């Protein structure tokens, strides 16, 4: 049967801003496939869905962490005990969300990507979500997450380097996250700045062969890489 | 024991924008009382909580209804069947949210309000939430909701008229919702415009006895009543 229906429901879920439902709908598109790949449209929806569901918990996690620290500085110890419990609950959510998208990548989407844009897309996403585990996980789970990120970003760059134009927003967007993760989580500015400037230089080397729709895609990203290189200096 | 804790958790829930949790926390404050009333702070949190939880479903309901109608006009009948199912689900949520706050008003907060500001506050809220049932319920449930609203708004105005200054933001805010409900749901512009201009005129009759904190409260509302009277003409 046709489940353009679940795709149509996911676009309604998006319009309604009911993102948890958007995820369940795109998870139903993905776990119903035999040999078929998600279209671009479909993989983009799955990604908008997870990005909005994880975004909201990341933002809760950041305000709850600021409060946790302001109250720790003031010696308000009953508050801290309460904030910690709340942070713990949000961490539980964050960790199950990451596990849901990782499980779908590891066992449906990555093993069935054929084109290279697809392989880079799913391997980047896998990295993106291990990076999110790494922002809050602790101990050995933080270490396994930082390594899973690096190794997914690397396997993605290997394929992006050969099989995708230097100007492709997947390859540029992979460069942006990879460069930021080297700097912010591995504390390696040399590397961060390097593959940033590499991704930028390479992509102006062929910027003189895009459309008026192809441009707005990768120009947005190219400018993000640029303001970081000047920032990072 | 002290459950300033649940109040503190509700303020964390608000900061995190986890409003469903804010509701559960303020519901726990309210269902734990013996003879005690919610403070102003507490009744305001309960209200911020329910307002954000119902706001998000009302907004989903409005975009899903616009889509439902655009697709009905274009003859896209598979879409409509899908949109209707989605609208139905959002209606289920809206109806259980309204029932939760109504159950807490009808059986904890209204029967124990002592001061009059408190009685007007809970009776207004009861009206506010029956008004929301009336926006989407259908048939006899819509009729029982429109009447429950009217009768809660009336019982509230009876008390606001004697026991609260004409300038009190509860009494003015009650006037705003009451006036809007007469116009938009009962289709009675004469009445809408009347008790709007009455609430405004009466409140400038004593506007020359407020603070610099008391003012910003009821001026915001007084200007809302004013732009409607000119609009409604």
Residue numbers in the entry:
A (entry chain A), B (entry chain A): 1 to 233
What do the authors say?
In potato, the nonepsilon 14-3-3 protein St14 interacts with the potato homolog of FT protein, StSP6A, and bZIP transcription factor StFDL1 and regulates potato tuber formation. Eleven 14-3-3 isoforms were reported in potato, designated as St14a-k.
Three chains (A, B, and C) are contained in the asymmetric unit, i.e., two conformations of dimers (AA and BC) exist in the crystal. The St14f dimer has a common characteristic cup-like shape with a disordered C-terminal region of approximately 20 amino acids, similar to other 14-3-3 proteins. Superposing three chains (A, B, and C) of St14f in the asymmetric unit, we found that the conformation of N-terminal helices A-G was very similar. In contrast, the conformations of the C-terminal helices H and I showed significant differences. The average B-factor of all helices A to G was 61 Å2, whereas the average B-factors of helices H and I were 73 and 98 Å2, respectively, suggesting that helices H and I are more flexible than other helices.
